[PDB]
Write a protein that binds this ligand. Structure first.
Ligand SMILES: *[C@@H]1O[C@H](CO)[C@@H](O)[C@H](O)[C@H]1NC(C)=O
Ligand SMILES: *[C@@H]1O[C@H](CO)[C@@H](O)[C@H](O)[C@H]1NC(C)=O
Ligand SMILES: *[C@@H]1O[C@H](CO)[C@@H](O)[C@H](O)[C@H]1NC(C)=O
Ligand SMILES: *[C@@H]1O[C@H](CO)[C@@H](O)[C@H](O)[C@H]1NC(C)=O
Ligand SMILES: *[C@@H]1O[C@H](CO)[C@@H](O)[C@H](O)[C@H]1NC(C)=O
Ligand SMILES: *[C@@H]1O[C@H](CO)[C@@H](O)[C@H](O)[C@H]1NC(C)=O
Ligand SMILES: [Ca+2]
Ligand SMILES: [Ca+2]
Ligand SMILES: [Ca+2]
Ligand SMILES: [Ca+2]
Ligand SMILES: [Ca+2]
Lengths: 388, 323, 478, 98
């Protein structure tokens, strides 16, 4: 990447490691997990790091295990503004044949609904865990080979581990390392026209298949042509200088100009597209400080404070009740409050004196002496001290 | 025919290409006309708060004009003078009223002194365009097809589908105005019902009926004779529109403003004629004829002599020279 | 109400089974293999289990067609994608496994299309390894190179130079003609077909080169290699996202750091990381001109190309158009525009879609000067859309291995009974060719090769210069 | 440089009769302003205007090649299936024939 390293060094990609020996990096070829990404209006990323766009309005199949049937994911697209080139995601439906043949549904908020029943988070069933992440985004985790992300305003993600190498099929592709075969319709033949690929995965026949995927919706709204240039010109400005040599910015720039000209409010469409880039720069190692009072700094409530890179392990009051559990989480970005204060259910965060206990799910107050005949339990400062 | 006509006359009112009126007190920019499959141009109308300000023509991606009733035209953000002729758009004044011709692209916009947008548009866009002035078809009932494509019964949420925002201002859904007329009714409907009625009674208007119907025009006036206090002149905006709408159909009317007690506003020296030629013989002009076979246009002009010189009528004896 | 038609029967949601997959999960031919959601059925009328809906007709058998490009195909019907045939049986398209012949390119001044298919931007001014075989752990037969001068910003400047190094040879080309600096040993495989606007140029059983005399470099390789090469064109493995493996054996993400790894002279200037933008230099803050160029590059999406746009995506070849002719200051020669469209038309021709896009007010391409040396104007030289490149001539009478089906350019056409020679520009009767047939067998028109090196005792050599029925004596080793 | 075709080996005969300095100032002015992309006509038409004036004074000129302002004439010889090939681009032929 245009800089020198001495011999013997070992730089590491996200995927694997490489070592310099005789002016030639030696590298391993061990597989590493993929990420299908939905975001913005209609902007997809396959597992094989392909980018494209398909603005159809039906229930499309996003992903599926296709040699056995451990799961299946189903996106549901709708038009999302006055324009016709604005088709955002409303909901996604997950299906686990391993447990009851159930049917999870991530709704347009941060809500989840199993089999029609709304649910309070967390949801530790046997395999699948569903919990908030920053208290503004849901995260499904089935087993150790599947993750998800929030489908409230339409930024679905997935994490498929290499045990699914090449044995999945959908809009997100085969997950085989080849970027070119991803336009493979279910009839087993690669299509060159994206307008044919997506409309082959629709689940309903009554839905209208589209004939052209447009590239410049700023023609129908020439007022936003100027603004869409200077707005996402910051994406190539040196504010993001640190991760041009980590991921190609040229598409994340291409997906901005389609979002800012198309959606109802180009304020947040702008600031949900610049974050699509920083969230990928951060997935490789580079964190960027791109927030300003002008460039969409979020408003953490009075109890909380903004924070760039922090630990979501010692935040929630449920942590003190279950301390022995492992938190093998990263250094995330969001709204926290200082280390003396821990997060309470009612939005405020409090010291650990009035931090309640969550014994057996039941929310006990900071001083609750409590006993059957044989056991003896009390809540001191977040933890439930039981005896016998 | 081979042409069309839209009009945004008076306050908040609209007249599409096909005999369909309504009211709309917008809050921001909105699309008047323009293609729908592919846009070579787009005529745009900015509203401050119900009352209108500017007509704008964005010629694809690269050029923009913003004329207002004001008239202080500008190109992008730089205020330019007037006349102006860049990119095949002659921005002239005709009959004391401002014009924006685009004959290469197939449209002729203009504004009057009071502020009344008008859009004459060619037959090339027959069953093509869609916007706030409706499609140019024969029918007049289907011409609310939203930006998605949806025949809507409401004349209001339609016009709010065709909104277009910028970076300087993002705009929301305007609300229909809460009419104060509903309590201040009084005598105002009894004595003033006649100025709307004289579209039907008087003989000078009693002959466009086989061409148009005044029933919408009388319908749209009676709701606006009630907010203005103490004036018969409140009827002549909805009446002035009826004059032009019959003129465009191929049957012009004459001398209707003699007894109507309302003449449209114009600057000093001139008053409202009817069917004056656009090629006004001015002072610093070349005495050439039989090239201006254009159709006849309404607007205010000078007296019989009193040639034009820089926006004022001056006597032919005092024609200056230039160097 | 409406009693539904005979061929199907109405359904009713049972109050017990949650799995009331009835009307909502209406299985058509698209969504049979696909798995469907359902809350409960409806008061509809659904086909039996043994059949499905098909465009307002409950087609009975599971014989319903096999879609491609949004078009019907009955079972048994075939389609030809590439060099493979492919037929539908179990509703899924059943293809062959004959990997086809890949093709680099240099679309414009500074772009490169790899074998597996990856357009990328690399403006350079040094000499660069386009493709070679000496890669890691291999013998190293051929080392095609490429070299540009004054070509970081496309313009009427940027003449290319190409030095190809096969079989210990050095044949190179620039300024229109091809030059041999060192002839190679096995002259039998060598061949040069100056047919039309191109210089087709074979070098072996599994190698070929094409050159439009101006900038394009389209080397064609066969099935033989399959991950034996590397360079700016990548490794030719099918995997499409490992074509940025630099010389130092790692994948890079920024192509401007890739080609800098493949320069020959390790002390010339490495090119500069340009700030990314949708507008090149001339089109930078000239939004007027940026639309006149965009519109004129929509010829790639026009009524005359509609057939090819369904096969070959034009979005790669459009980005090159806007990039080149912004930077290019076209004044007298509109070649930095007319050459990016011809590069798309030729790819459309290889897939069997000949096109006539060229008129008198757009990229004219006359052919009248060849019909000038003769005082009598015979008029055999014509600009054909896409004529075969591999024909028979006095110099190459036999049929050659033909990597290119057809090519644009000026082609000589005259009635039969006459064969073309290039030195005498017109076509001439066959007997006037300096053709050779020594001792009976059919072969070329006297190639300048020493046949039979193998056996000394059977050293029975018979050359032929132009016409002579001669045979030469072998010099004994003893 | 490209407008110095007006002062080239092929025009030396006419440069002695007709001053090229007027017709050169037009060349530099037009094709700067002109954004020639597909049609190089804002350049090829300023030289033809000089060649025609050179023709009126009896100096016919052939300045037009295949890499500079080609001007094919093959489409008129197309409506007939049999290609008779009578239309040709002739340098300066008489305009007033029968
Ligand atoms: C009207 O013109 C004045 C003076 O040129 C300018 O200050 C003002 O902004 C204009 N207002 C509108 C509504 O165009
Ligand atoms: C075009 O307009 C005609 C009548 O004006 C209508 O019948 C037809 O459906 C329209 N076509 C399209 C494509 O909407
Ligand atoms: C394709 O057809 C052939 C011949 O009928 C058959 O042998 C083969 O199994 C088919 N291919 C597939 C993928 O089933
Ligand atoms: C071009 O070549 C094709 C096939 O060789 C032939 O059918 C056609 O007539 C030719 N066109 C011209 C203009 O000579
Ligand atoms: C044929 O080869 C002989 C040598 O054996 C040579 O003398 C003669 O000139 C050649 N003939 C032609 C026509 O080249
Ligand atoms: C055609 O060109 C010739 C010379 O090339 C010239 O003599 C002649 O005048 C031109 N026109 C005709 C009608 O021959
Ligand atoms: Ca794949
Ligand atoms: Ca209508
Ligand atoms: Ca590869
Ligand atoms: Ca064939
Ligand atoms: Ca003479």
């Amino acid at each position: 990447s245009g800089k020198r390293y001495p011999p013997g060094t070992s730089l590491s990609r996200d995927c694997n490691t490489c070592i310099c020996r005789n002016s030639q990096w030696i590298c391993s070829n061990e597989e590493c997990p993929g990420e299908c990404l939905v975001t913005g209006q209609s902007h997809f990323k396959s597992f094989d790091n392909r980018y494209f766009t398909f603005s159809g309005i039906c229930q499309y199949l996003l992903a599926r295990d296709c040699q056995d049937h451990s799961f299946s994911i189903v996106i549901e697209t709708v038009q999302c503004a006055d324009d016709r080139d604005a088709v955002c995601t409303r909901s996604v439906t997950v299906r686990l044949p391993g447990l009851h043949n159930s049917l999870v549904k991530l709704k347009h908020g941060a809500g989840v609904a199993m089999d029609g029943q709304d649910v309070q988070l967390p949801l530790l069933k046997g395999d699948l865990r569903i919990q908030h992440t920053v208290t503004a985004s849901v995260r499904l985790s089935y087993g150790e080979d599947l993750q998800m992300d929030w489908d409230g305003r339409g930024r679905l993600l997935v994490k498929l581990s290499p045990v699914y190498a090449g044995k999945t099929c959908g809009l997100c592709g085969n997950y085989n390392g080849n970027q070119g075969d991803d336009f493979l319709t279910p009839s087993g033949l690669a299509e060159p026209r994206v307008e044919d690929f997506g409309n082959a995965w629709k689940l309903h026949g009554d839905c209208q298949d589209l004939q052209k995927q447009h590239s410049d919706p700023c023609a129908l709204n020439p007022r936003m042509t100027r603004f869409s240039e200077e707005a996402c010109a910051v994406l190539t400005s040196p504010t993001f200088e640190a991760c041009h040599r980590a991921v190609s910015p040229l598409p994340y720039l291409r997906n901005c100009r389609y979002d800012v000209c198309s959606c109802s409010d180009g304020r947040e469409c702008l600031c949900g597209a610049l974050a699509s880039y920083a969230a990928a720069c951060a997935g490789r190692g580079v964190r960027v400080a791109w927030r300003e009072p002008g460039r969409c700094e979020l408003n953490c409530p009075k109890g909380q404070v903004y924070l760039q890179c922090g630990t979501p392990c010692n935040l929630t009051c449920r942590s003190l009740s279950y301390p022995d559990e492992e938190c093998n989480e990263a250094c995330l970005e969001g709204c926290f409050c200082p280390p003396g204060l821990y997060m309470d259910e009612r939005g405020d965060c409090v010291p650990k004196a009035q931090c309640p206990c969550y014994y057996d799910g039941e929310i006990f107050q900071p001083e609750d002496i409590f006993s059957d005949h044989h056991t003896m339990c009390y809540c001191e400062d977040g933890f439930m001290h039981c005896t016998m | 025919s081979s042409t069309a006509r839209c009009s945004l006359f008076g306050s908040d009112f609209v007249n599409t290409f096909d005999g369909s009126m309504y009211s709309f007190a917008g809050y921001c920019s909105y699309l008047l006309a323009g293609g729908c499959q592919k846009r070579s141009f787009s005529i745009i109308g900015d509203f401050q708060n119900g009352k209108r300000v500017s007509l704008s023509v964005y010629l694809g991606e690269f050029f923009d004009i913003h004329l207002f009733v004001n008239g202080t035209v500008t190109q992008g953000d730089q205020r330019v003078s007037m006349p102006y002729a860049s990119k095949g758009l002659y921005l002239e004044t005709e009959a004391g009223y401002y014009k924006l011709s685009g004959e290469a692209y197939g449209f002729v916009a203009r504004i009057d002194g009071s502020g009344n947008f008008q859009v004459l548009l060619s037959d090339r866009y027959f069953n093509k365009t869609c916007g706030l002035c409706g499609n140019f078809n024969i029918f007049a009932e289907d011409d609310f097809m939203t930006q998605e494509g949806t025949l809507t019964s409401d004349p209001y949420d339609f016009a709010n589908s065709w909104a277009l925002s910028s970076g300087e201002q993002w705009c929301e859904r305007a609300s229909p105005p809460s009419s104060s007329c509903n309590i201040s009714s009084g005598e105002m409907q009894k004595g003033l019902w006649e100025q709307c009625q004289l579209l039907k009674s008087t003989s000078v208007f009693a002959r466009c009926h086989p061409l148009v119907d005044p029933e919408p025009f009388v319908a749209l006036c009676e709701k606006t004779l009630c907010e203005c206090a103490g004036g018969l002149e409140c009827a002549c905006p909805a009446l002035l529109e009826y004059a032009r709408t019959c003129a465009q159909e191929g049957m012009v009317l004459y001398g209707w403003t003699d007894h109507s007690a309302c003449s449209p506003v114009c600057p000093a020296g001139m008053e409202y004629r009817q069917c004056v030629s656009p090629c006004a013989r001015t002072c610093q002009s070349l005495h050439i004829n039989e090239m201006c076979q254009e159709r006849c246009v309404d607007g205010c002009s000078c007296p019989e002599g009193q040639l034009l010189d820089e926006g004022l009528c001056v006597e032919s004896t005092e024609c200056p020279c230039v160097h | 109400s409406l009693s539904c038609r005979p061929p199907m029967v109405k359904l009713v949601c049972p109050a017990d089974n949650l799995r009331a997959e009835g009307l909502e999960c209406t299985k058509t031919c698209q969504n049979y293999d696909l798995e469907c959601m359902s809350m409960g059925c409806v008061s509809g009328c659904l086909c039996p289990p043994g059949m499905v809906r098909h465009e307002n007709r409950c087609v009975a058998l599971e014989r319903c067609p096999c879609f491609h490009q949004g078009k019907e195909y009955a079972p048994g019907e075939t389609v030809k994608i590439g060099c493979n045939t492919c037929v539908c049986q179990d509703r899924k398209w059943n293809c062959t496994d004959h990997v086809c012949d890949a093709t680099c390119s240099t679309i414009g001044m500074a772009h490169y299309l790899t074998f597996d298919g990856l357009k990328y931007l690399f403006p350079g001014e040094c000499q660069y390894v386009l493709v070679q075989d000496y890669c890691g752990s291999n013998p190293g037969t051929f080392r095609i190179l490429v070299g540009n001068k004054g070509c970081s910003h496309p313009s009427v400047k940027c003449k290319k130079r190409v030095t190809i190094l096969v079989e210990g040879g050095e044949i190179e080309l620039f300024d229109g003609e091809v030059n041999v600096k060192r002839p190679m040993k096995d002259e039998t495989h060598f061949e040069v077909v100056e047919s039309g606007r191109y210089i087709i140029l074979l070098l072996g059983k599994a190698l070929s080169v094409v050159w439009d005399r101006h900038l394009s470099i389209s080397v064609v390789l066969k099935q033989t290699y399959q991950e034996k090469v590397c360079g700016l064109c990548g490794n030719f493995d099918g995997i499409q996202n490992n074509d940025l493996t630099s010389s130092n054996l790692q994948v890079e993400e920024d192509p401007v750091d890739f080609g800098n790894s493949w320069k020959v002279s390790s002390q010339c200037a490495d090119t500069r990381k340009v700030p990314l933008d949708s507008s090149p230099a001339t089109c930078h803050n000239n939004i007027m001109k940026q639309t006149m160029v965009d519109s004129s590059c929509r010829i790639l999406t026009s009524d005359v190309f509609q057939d090819c746009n369904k096969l070959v995506d034009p979005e790669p070849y459009l980005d090159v158009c806007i990039y080149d002719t912004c930077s290019c200051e076209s004044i007298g020669d509109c070649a930095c525009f007319c050459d990016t469209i011809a590069a798309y038309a030729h790819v459309c021709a290889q897939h069997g879609k000949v096109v006539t896009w060229r008129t008198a007010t757009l990229c004219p391409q006359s052919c009248e000067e060849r019909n000038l040396r003769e005082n009598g104007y015979e008029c055999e030289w014509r600009y054909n859309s896409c004529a075969p490149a591999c024909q028979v001539t006095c110099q190459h009478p036999e049929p050659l291995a033909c990597p290119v089906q057809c090519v644009e350019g000026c082609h000589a056409h005259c009635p039969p009974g006459k064969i073309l020679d290039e030195l005498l520009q017109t076509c001439v009767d066959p007997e006037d060719c300096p053709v050779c047939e020594v001792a009976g067998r059919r072969f070329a028109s006297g190639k300048k090769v020493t046949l039979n090196p193998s056996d000394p005792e059977h050293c029975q050599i018979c050359h032929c210069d132009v016409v002579n029925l001669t045979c030469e004596a072998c010099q004994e080793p003893g």
